[PDB]
Specification:
This is part of a larger assembly, with five copies of chain A. By secondary structure, chain A is an alpha/beta fold. Chain A folds into two domains: 1-367, no CATH class; 368-1058, no CATH class. In chain A, 25% of the residues lie in helices and 14% in strands. Chain A contains 32 helices and 36 strands. In chain A, the strands form eleven sheets. In chain A, strands 30-29-28-31-32-36-35 form a seven-stranded mixed beta sheet. In chain A, a hairpin with a 4-residue loop joins strand 33 (981-982) and strand 34. In chain A, helix 4 (115-123) crosses helix 5 (129-136), helix 9 (268-276) packs across helix 10 (296-306) and helix 9 (268-276) packs across helix 11 (311-320). The longest helix of chain A has 18 residues, at 228-245. Chain A is elongated and about 130 Å long. The two termini of chain A are 77 Å apart. Chain A binds chain B through residues 365, 367, 369, 371-376, 378-380, 767, 770, 817, 864-866, 885-887, 889-890, 991, and chain B through 8-16, 19-25, 27, 38. Strand 12 of chain A pairs parallel with strand 2 (14-15) of chain B, so a sheet runs across the interface. Bound molecules: S-adenosyl-L-homocysteine (3 copies). The site of one S-adenosyl-L-homocysteine has 9 residues of chain B, from loops. The site of one S-adenosyl-L-homocysteine (SAH) has 13 residues of chain A, from loops. It is classed as virus. The entry lists the keywords dsRNA virus, Reoviridae, RNA capping, RNA methyltransferase, virus. Identification of the active sites in the methyltransferases of a transcribing dsRNA virus. Chains A, B, C, D, E: Structural protein VP3.
Chain lengths: 1058, 53, 106, 53, 53
């Protein structure tokens, strides 16, 4: 019992002006000048000219005499705006000027002027008997009471009814009317019962429950095909009036029920009337409402005929056969009972019927607004699948779905230029290891680096990464700019790549003027210029940490040894144009003016001299080692003495080469030299191209040589030919719970009817998915899914398929998303370095676990059910020990997963590991259970106490990962620091709280008297390739320089002891 | 980074459940929850939904 | 619709719970179905010193000749009123008045 | 304001929540709830500083 | 209605541009559904058997 309420009051009757004010609101509207009253919008559809007069000039029909002459015609036939805003205001004024109605000024204050009938007669020139009546006595149109307005124009004529054509709101749509109306003479209640029984068996007519004026009037349609456009138009409104009532509010739409009642009619509106008179459960809407509606509702009416379900069908069929009575629903009927006693003597539709059975809804949920929904699928649900179909899809097209790859990326501005400096560590080069390192370099050189490594090397390049964006700030440069500021990182950037010509500075800040009519060409950048512009900066950063320089003092000379003919010189000359006198020279063994063609070093004489030298010598395939070496070593020694602070470049950083480079410098030169190699950004990731910066010491160098060689090691991991190139691909096919699929991704389209059938199966291969419909009424849904081995290893544990069919089936038809135009999908995704580092972390341990004799269980401590991949076989039990995580559903489905909701400890108080338990200790031996930070002397106990117990436990490997000290300073002198930031005292990796470092010299030493077995294994290249190939993940370019250093100094120590 | 999630979402909003099965590693500095709806269920079942959010 | 802001303490909280519940109390005052929705309306009619009128407001127009006749009676139901003539020589005066129970009781 | 939740009042408060929930809030209270909304209050003005913009 | 069909662009626009004058372009007037195919190659096999050319 809710019985909602409302206010019922005629909305047309209370529009007619007063009989003594009707004068004012018609002609004397020449004083004001319109402006806001009428509504006008213009679309270049084209074309649309929706000029619509509002009250009191609404529902006003136009006479064909004063329609075309005054206004309407000419303004329309511009036609194409055009259409000055002045034209509408001034011209419409001219029309509204010369117009008036016949009326008599009265004195009684309780009279009203009949607008509708008055303007009807006027517009027809009083030709008809109905319009002539109001000429001899124009005072007939004054009335004090509705209904009695019309009673006076049936008795005076002797006629039974008056037919009147309708008004079209749009005044430029000069077409025949869809229908007209007819007003009947009916005084009392007993007359309406007589007339409505006469309306039967007559062409095409309709009514609508109650009426405005308390007098029966009906609708008469022109043709059968133009009736459903009117029924479907009213039905839509009733669905909105009861939407606010059923919840409970305040409405003012009199009548109560908007739905039309078909009297004598066809057979298409009897089906339409039935489906509308039961208030379907379109919630959310669905239905396909926007368009066409007039055909969507006809398909809807077909639903309830067989659907869905039971007495719902019966109700439908009890209305289809009848469609002669007004069907209401208790609560909605009460509105008439409430207002029939508030004012007696008012006509309603005689024939009513009341029912109380809705009964219920499904219900549904969806949306029909632009968008492209992403999905996230799980491995559990409330349904049970067995032996299902293979839902096949194919044909993507090239218009809707475009498939490409590099991938293009988006970064910042200053991040384009950064580097990481390394430092030697060794002080002696043994004479017994000088030929051991040689043998490694000689044996390795013969066979070029892995073929699998070269699958990404020359496939993608920095040019293809940065240029796309770099040439978009070119368009920005044009016409547009702000405060630039000389010297800045933005300065030399827009001076270089954006503009071929020079740049004039006025005030050191402004950019002016503008390109009047000549468009300056975009500076043609090259592959051998991007490496030089990022190294020029590094050269200035190595000189002094003081930022904001970039320009040199007058009378400074820099020379490049290319890599000719290449630009670079022009770029580093135009930049140093404004600053007094600077000399930028270029030389090489393939050069062109102004670059000078020479050899290296070149015969005696010529007297080369400069302040800085940047050497880029190398190429071009090939020569045997014994001859290649003599060429590489000869380049270094002829640039070290050529300048005071030079930088050289070598290939094959093999720890023999780098040591032979130093050896050949320490002997010749006096007071030795100080050397250190470095990587820079924009150097084509995994290209094993290091650079060697040389400084004339300052006294005597401590550690000139290299020992373990960290940055070099990357190179010394390549192997000969092996298996296969792998290479991702597509499938366009889905089996149900069947193993063995090649890495990559697949996509297509399916029938919306079986859309949720596909979604129930995609969960076996991937976690992410994307769907969208092309158009609202295509019924085809496009699907893209991506295969991840992080989910495969979690899907195929046992036999349970379950899944959640019920969940996804609640989308059909609509709710899968709508998207127009074209969209481009890529292949190699984009991941940071926090994720890839871990992909190397687990790619390592996987090799170690799946090799040992026997296993009982694999135990992880800390995570989100992560590191599932690496558990081998899948038959192996998997145990998780962490304080915070989700349980139950995932562990109930016989996945061999179990979780202990207790905080682990490292005190050797309660250890119980036993035969064959493989423990992982990722990052949980660092900070606190909450997220604070722990000392560096309290983390050592987490190894001492694990070992102490492990000593007695039967061969039980423990895998421990911890940070290596030395980073302190190694990432302090670097210029790249976007990530892996160091907060003076602590390392700030990702988020968390900055953590303390662990002195590796002490951590290793302290385990040489307690522990027994402890092998430290660092992730190497092979793990990077497999990681990127399986997942399909590109390297983050500027994060690639981060990876190949950060990777090294996170040791994974394997404690496999018995 | 401004992320949006819900049980009726559309790109760039991500369609998920709450809390959602394990894995996926939700993480942020601030969370604003507006969960609720949409009629209806008895108290003993409603309570278990409100308290779980 | 209240909101709950959660903070990881800073030490140990003194008074975590609610007792009387002030802001919540607002909710705990609703009752089941009772009488009627009330709902304001209009009258367009004036009796002289006669009790029993529904809450709301009423308005219309009268002959200027008996304009001050109406004003003498409106004082029984309201305190505020608004009048205006449409045009200088219409002789019709529009009146709006609003019923207040603060005046009915007086 | 409170520091203790009595075990004798933990089921007294429950009975109030359970008995109340069954019947939705007053019908008279809902005469203003979904009748007027903030949107209808602030938007009118909020879209006039659009014209100012 | 079938989601696994493709429209022959090349042959379709060839006929249109010639006003369906030739036997090859007239074929696709009486039955314009001939230009729908699910498999390449089979697109053309249908317009040699139907003509005899
Ligand atoms: N002493 C020397 N002997 C031979 N070639 C030298 C040299 N010094 C520099 N070079 C040149 O350096 C180049 C190595 S590759 C340089 C890149 C290339 N110029 C480009 O524009 O992409 C070789 O082509 C070689 O001609
Ligand atoms: N006694 C204990 N031993 C091992 N790990 C623990 C522990 N107590 C808590 N942890 C876990 O250690 C983790 C520290 S944060 C680790 C990263 C986080 N899991 C992520 O996904 O980003 C927490 O997740 C916590 O659940
Ligand atoms: N865990 C969960 N389970 C179900 N629905 C959830 C949910 N978390 C959020 N929601 C969503 O939150 C909504 C509560 S009402 C939200 C307002 C509505 N989205 C609007 O645009 O006006 C529900 O529609 C529901 O779909």
């Amino acid at each position: 019992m809710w019985h909602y309420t409302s206010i019922n009051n005629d909305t047309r009757v209370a529009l007619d002006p007063k009989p003594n004010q009707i004068r004012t609101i018609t002609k004397p509207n020449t004083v004001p000048q319109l402006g806001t009253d009428y509504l006008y919008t213009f679309n270049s559809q084209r074309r649309s000219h929706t000029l619509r007069l509002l009250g009191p000039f609404q529902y006003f029909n136009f006479s064909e005499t004063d329609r075309g002459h005054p206004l309407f015609r000419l303004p329309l036939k511009y036609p194409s705006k055009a259409i000055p805003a002045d034209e509408l205001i001034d011209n419409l004024h001219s029309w509204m000027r010369s117009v008036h109605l016949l009326h008599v000024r009265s004195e009684d204050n309780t009279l009203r002027y009949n607008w509708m009938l008055g303007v009807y007669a006027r517009s027809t020139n009083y030709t008809t008997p109905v319009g002539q009546l109001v000429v001899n006595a124009p005072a007939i149109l004054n009335y004090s009471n509705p209904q009695d307005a019309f009673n006076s124009v049936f008795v005076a004529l002797g006629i039974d009814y008056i037919d009147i054509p309708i008004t079209n709101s749009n005044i430029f749509d000069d077409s025949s009317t869809p229908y007209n109306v007819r007003i009947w003479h009916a005084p009392t209640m007993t007359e309406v019962n007589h007339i409505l029984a006469l309306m039967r068996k007559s062409t095409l007519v309709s009514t609508h429950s109650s009426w405005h004026w308390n007098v029966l009037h009906t609708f008469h349609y022109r043709s059968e095909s133009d009736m459903i456009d009117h029924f479907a138009a009213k039905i839509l409104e009733d669905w909105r009036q009861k939407e606010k009532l059923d919840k409970g509010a305040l409405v003012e739409a009199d009548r109560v029920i908007q739905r039309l009642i078909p009297l004598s009619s066809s057979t298409y509106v009897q089906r339409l009337a039935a489906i509308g008179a039961l208030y379907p459960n379109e919630f959310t809407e669905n239905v396909l409402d926007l368009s066409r509606l007039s055909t969507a509702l006809l398909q809807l009416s077909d639903t309830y005929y067989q659907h869905a379900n039971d007495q719902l069908r019966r109700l439908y069929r009890r209305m289809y056969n009848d469609s002669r009575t007004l069907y209401m629903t208790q609560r909605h009927q009460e509105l008439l009972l409430a207002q029939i006693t508030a004012d007696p003597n008012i006509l309603l539709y005689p024939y009513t019927y009341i029912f109380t059975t809705i009964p219920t809804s499904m219900n549904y949920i969806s949306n029909t607004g632009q968008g492209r929904i992403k999905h996230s699928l799980t491995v559990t649900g409330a349904t049970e699948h067995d032996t299902v179909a293979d839902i096949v899809l194919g044909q993507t097209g090239e218009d809707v779905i475009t498939i490409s790859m590099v991938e293009p990326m988006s970064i910042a501005v200053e991040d384009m230029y950064g580097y990481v400096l390394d430092t030697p560590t060794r002080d002696i080069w043994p004479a017994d290891e000088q030929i051991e390192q040689k043998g490694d370099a000689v044996a390795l050189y013969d066979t070029k680096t892995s073929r699998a490594l070269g699958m990404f090397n020359n496939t993608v390049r920095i040019d293809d990464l940065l240029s796309p964006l770099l040439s978009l700030v070119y368009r920005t440069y044009i016409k547009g700019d702000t405060m630039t500021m000389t010297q800045g990182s933005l300065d030399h950037l827009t001076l270089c790549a954006a503009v071929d010509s020079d740049i004039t500075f006025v005030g050191n800040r402004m950019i002016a003027p503008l390109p009047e009519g000549y468009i300056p060409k975009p500076m043609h950048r090259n592959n051998s210029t991007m490496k030089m512009l990022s190294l020029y900066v590094a050269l200035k950063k190595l000189e002094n940490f003081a930022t904001n320089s970039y320009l040199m003092a007058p009378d400074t000379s820099i020379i490049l040894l290319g890599a000719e003919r290449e630009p670079a010189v022009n770029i580093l000359r135009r930049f140093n144009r404004n600053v007094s006198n600077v000399r930028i020279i270029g030389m090489g063994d393939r050069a062109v003016e102004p670059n000078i063609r020479v050899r290296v070093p070149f015969p005696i004489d010529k007297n080369i001299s400069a302040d800085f030298i940047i050497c880029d010598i190398n190429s071009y395939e090939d020569q045997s080692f014994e001859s290649m070496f003599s060429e590489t070593i000869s380049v270094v020694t002829t640039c070290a003495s050529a300048a005071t602070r030079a930088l050289v470049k070598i290939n094959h950083p093999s720890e023999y080469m780098i040591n032979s480079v130093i050896e050949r410098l320490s002997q010749l030169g006096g007071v030795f030299y100080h050397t250190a190699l470095l990587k820079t950004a924009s150097q084509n990731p995994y290209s094993y191209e290091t650079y060697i910066y040389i400084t004339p010491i300052a006294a005597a160098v401590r550690f000139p040589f290299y020992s373990n060689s960290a940055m070099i090691n990357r190179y010394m991991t390549a192997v000969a030919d092996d298996e296969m190139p792998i290479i991702p691909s597509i499938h366009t096919v889905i089996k149900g719970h069947s193993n063995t699929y090649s890495p990559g991704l697949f996509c297509g389209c399916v029938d919306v009817q079986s859309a949720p059938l596909a979604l129930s199966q995609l969960k076996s291969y991937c976690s992410e998915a994307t769907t969208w419909r092309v158009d609202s009424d295509d019924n085809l849904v496009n699907i893209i899914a991506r295969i991840d081995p992080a989910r495969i290893a979690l899907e195929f544990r046992t036999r349970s398929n379950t899944s959640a069919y019920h969940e996804y089936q609640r989308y059909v038809p609509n709710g899968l998303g709508f998207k127009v135009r074209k969209t481009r999908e890529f292949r190699y995704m984009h991941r940071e370095v926090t994720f890839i580092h871990k992909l190397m972390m687990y790619a390592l341990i996987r090799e170690q676990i799946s090799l040992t004799e026997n296993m009982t269980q694999v135990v992880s401590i800390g995570g989100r059910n992560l590191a599932d991949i690496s558990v081998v076989p899948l038959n192996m039990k998997y145990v998780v020990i962490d304080p915070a995580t989700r349980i139950e559903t995932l562990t109930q489905e016989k996945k061999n997963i179990e979780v202990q909701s207790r905080p682990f400890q490292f005190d050797a108080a309660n250890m119980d590991l036993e035969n064959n338990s493989i423990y992982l200790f990722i990052a949980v031996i660092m900070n606190e259970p909450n997220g604070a930070a722990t000392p560096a002397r309290m983390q050592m106990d987490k190894i001492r106490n694990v070992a102490t117990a492990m000593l007695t436990r039967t061969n039980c490997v423990a895998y421990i990962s911890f940070y290596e000290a030395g980073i302190i300073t190694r990432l302090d002198q670097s210029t790249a620091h976007k990530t892996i930031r160091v907060e003076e005292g602590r390392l700030k990796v990702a988020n968390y709280v900055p953590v303390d470092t662990l002195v590796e010299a002490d951590v290793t030493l302290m385990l040489r008297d307690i522990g027994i077995t402890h092998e430290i294994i660092r992730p190497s290249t092979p793990e990077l390739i497999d990681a990127c190939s399986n997942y399909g993940i590109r390297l983050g370019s500027t994060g690639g320089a981060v990876l190949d250093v950060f990777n090294h100094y996170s040791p994974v120590i394997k404690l496999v002891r018995s």
